Structure formats: structure tokens, C-alpha cells
Amino acid sequence: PQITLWKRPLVTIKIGGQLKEALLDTGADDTVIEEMSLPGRWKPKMIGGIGGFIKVRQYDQIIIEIAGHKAIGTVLVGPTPVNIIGRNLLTQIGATLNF
Amino acid sequence: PQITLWKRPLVTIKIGGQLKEALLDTGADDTVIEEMSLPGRWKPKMIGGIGGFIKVRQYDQIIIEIAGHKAIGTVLVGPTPVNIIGRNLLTQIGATLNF
Ligand SMILES: [C][C]([C])[C]N([C][C]([O])[C]([C]C1=[C][C]=[C][C]=[C]1)[N]C(=O)O[C]1[C]O[C]2O[C][C][C]12)S(=O)(=O)C1=[C][C]=C([B]([O])=O)[C]=[C]1
Ligand SMILES: [Cl-]
Ligand SMILES: [Cl-]
């Protein structure tokens, strides 16, 4: 698809058997999801933006379906105010910014 | 251009006659720039990011060039970790997300 930016580029994702709404975010290096359970090993991480840092759990090799496209990569889980799909997964679905 | 996302989508901007580096950020409603001098009166705004809220100064109708594309619009000035070009100006330069 071609997604205009008049409003927030929100899409439905499937992660860990759950449906969530998430923001397609070219300004995010990594994908950050609100608190949920994911299988496998994890390690703690601090990530920072406007307003400072939050502590998250880093899960690797997680499969996500993003607007119908499957991708695998790292997902950070923690107290983010919005679910964010970052570049680490946007690349896998072939997303580009065009102007 | 067509910008892939394997690296951060950084561009050069020109604001107040000076060149700066900024991130093309589809996850940002607003454009937020590090502390600098801008003309005219400003208005208060509170914006919420991943780590909480910060106060910024809102300047309207500011002339700004983004990767060579001319825009005129609202610029927020404050303690952002990086200069971010948000959807208010990404729409002015005709940017879409594509996959
Ligand atoms: C600031 C950017 C450089 C990095 N962020 C990504 C942005 O797209 C962020 C995404 C976002 C959106 C809503 C609420 C909270 C955050 N938007 C953002 O702050 O917008 C502000 C300006 O306009 C307003 O509209 C939206 C909020 C206001 S981040 O979330 O901090 C981040 C940092 C590190 C990592 B990591 O993987 O290390 C991943 C993500
Ligand atoms: Cl990854
Ligand atoms: Cl104020």
C-alpha cells in the first residue's frame, strides 16, 4: 500500500497470538510494544526518547504479522505510551519513505 | 527520493540560514528541533514521548528546507534528543510510506 501521513500511520499487527494497533515509525530504531507476555529468553534494556528513558525486556527472533506481511526480529516490551513498529521490522516488509 | 530504512532516515534541513541534521519521523505528529533562536512570538506546548512529557516552544509559519524541499510551518523547540521532522512537515513535502 501507499500510506499518506495526514494522520498517524496506524496498522493492525499480530504478535504473540494477540492483535494490537501499532504506529509505523521511521524514527524508531527498534519495535517497542506495551506490556505483554512473549515466549523465550529476554534481557533488560534501557531505551530513550523525548522525556527520557524507559526499561524494557528485549526478546529476539519474534514473529510479527504487520498489515499482512510476516517478519521476524527483536521486540522490546515495556511501558511505551504507543505501540511502535521500528525500522528493524519496517525493513523486513520492504517499507520505504517516498517523496 | 525513495528512502530505505536499514539506517536512520537522516536528512539535512535548513532553518534560520543554518544547516542541521534531522530524522524523518513518521511516528512524530510534530516537528521538534533542539534549542535554537527563531523569530517571532511563541506559544506553549506539552508533548509526550516514550519517556514522558517535555515542554517546548511552538513557533508557527517558520521557513524550513527539508532535503532540499521548501516547507513553511510549525516548529517546536525544546530538549529533544535529536531533531525530528514530523508529519506536519512530511505532508508538506509529499512524503508517503510504501510497501
Ligand atoms: C524521538 C525519536 C528519536 C525516537 N522515538 C520515536 C518517535 O517516532 C516517537 C514515537 C512515539 C509516539 C507517541 C508516543 C511516544 C513515542 N515520537 C515522538 O516522540 O513524537 C513526539 C513529537 O510529536 C508528537 O507526536 C507523537 C509524540 C510526540 S522514541 O519513541 O522515543 C524511541 C526511542 C528509542 C527506540 B530504540 O529502539 O532504541 C525506539 C523508539
Ligand atoms: Cl531485529
Ligand atoms: Cl511555557
Secondary structure E strands in A1-99? 2-3, 10-15, 18-24, 31-33, 42-49, 52-66, 69-77, 84-85, 96-98
Cell numbers at A62, concatenated: 519474534
Residues of chain B with a CB closer than 8 angstroms to some CB in chain A: 1-6, 8-9, 23-29, 32, 47-54, 67, 69, 80-81, 84, 87, 90-91, 93-99
What residue has cell string 528512502?
A: B3
Min Cα separation A73/chain B (Å): 13
B66, closest residue in chain A (CA to CA): A99
Grid cell listed for B93: 513535502
Element (H, E) at B47: strand B43-49
Q: CA A58, A88, A40: angle at the middle one, nearest 5?
A: 30
Q: Which residues constitute the domain of residue B25?
A: 1-99
CATH of the domain at B95: 2.40.70.10
Measured on CA atoms in the order B8, B49, A5, A9, is the torsion positive or negative?
positive
The finding on whether B8 has its CB within 6 A of some atom of ligand 1 is no
Element housing B89 (H / E) = helix B87-90
DSSP 8-state assignment for residue A91:
T
The experimental technique used to determine this model is: X-ray
Tally of domains within chain B: 1
Pick from A20, A38, A23, A80: nearest CA to B28: A23
CA–CA gap between residue B44 and residue B23 (Å, rounded): 23
